[PDB]
Amino acid sequence: LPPLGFAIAQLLGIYILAQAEDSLLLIDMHAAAERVNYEKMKRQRQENGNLQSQHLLIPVTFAASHEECAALADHAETLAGFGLELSDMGGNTLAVRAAPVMLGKSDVVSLARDVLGELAQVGASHENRILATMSCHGSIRAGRRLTLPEMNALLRDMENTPRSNQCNHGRPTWVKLTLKELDTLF
């Protein structure tokens, strides 16, 4: 499998550069990972009817605005279907006991807040909150992508996952430079 590229390193915070047969390729990690996460979450939603969940140490100290607690009082079965299981601590606070896998890694409060504030005004009936709203984690925002034996895993983003070239707007998420970057040296 000669892939898109072979990840070689990071680029100052937002790009991941990968060498291939052509040249080094600059993948916008957050954008490409948002695309692939949206794709994988919808593929895992059309099948089995729920997102993959995961628990975790150290719950989050939600702080849970008033009516979001009542939204959790409303059937949390849908919340379990989004991979987010969370519990009430008292007064008007919460804490997530389980976050969906494929995101993790921080700020689970934002994901749970998005879906829980969506639980107001039951009608659901849209299901396109699983997009950038629920994909409001993407990959790592600007910090770290390990020591490379996971960078190639994101470099495998668009293999067997469609909607590659055109992003959520049309902005490219990868290659611009070719082997003929020697012109830049003039």
d(CA 41, CA 101): 10
* Strand order across the beta sheet in which 15-19 lies: 6-11, 15-19, 24-28
Interface stretch with its own copies, choices 33-41, 89-97, 100-108, 140-148 (CB under 8 A): 89-97
d(CA 108, CA 51): 15
By beta-carbon proximity to its own copies, the closer residue of 91 and 123 is 91
Cβ at position 153, least distance to its own copies in Å? 31
Interface stretch with its own copies, choices 1-9, 57-65, 86-94, 110-118 (CB under 8 A): 86-94
* Strand order across the beta sheet in which 53-55 lies: 53-55, 93-100, 85-90
Cβ at position 119, least distance to its own copies in Å? 19
Contact 96, 72 (CB under 8 A): no
User: Is 149 an interacting residue with respect to its own copies (CB under 8 A)?
Assistant: no
- The helix (run of H) or strand (run of E) holding residue 103 is none
Cβ at position 40, least distance to its own copies in Å? 39
Cβ at position 94, least distance to its own copies in Å? 14
By beta-carbon proximity to its own copies, the closer residue of 142 and 179 is 179
By beta-carbon proximity to its own copies, the closer residue of 58 and 179 is 179
Contact 62, 71 (CB under 8 A): no
User: Is 180 an interacting residue with respect to its own copies (CB under 8 A)?
Assistant: no
By beta-carbon proximity to its own copies, the closer residue of 92 and 161 is 92
Cβ at position 59, least distance to its own copies in Å? 17
User: Is 90 an interacting residue with respect to its own copies (CB under 8 A)?
Assistant: yes
The residue written with tokens 């993407």 in the block is: 138
List C-alpha distances in Å: 65 to 3, 104, 105, 116, 133. Answer: 46, 23, 23, 10, 18
Residues that bind its own copies (CB under 8 A): 90-92, 179, 182, 186
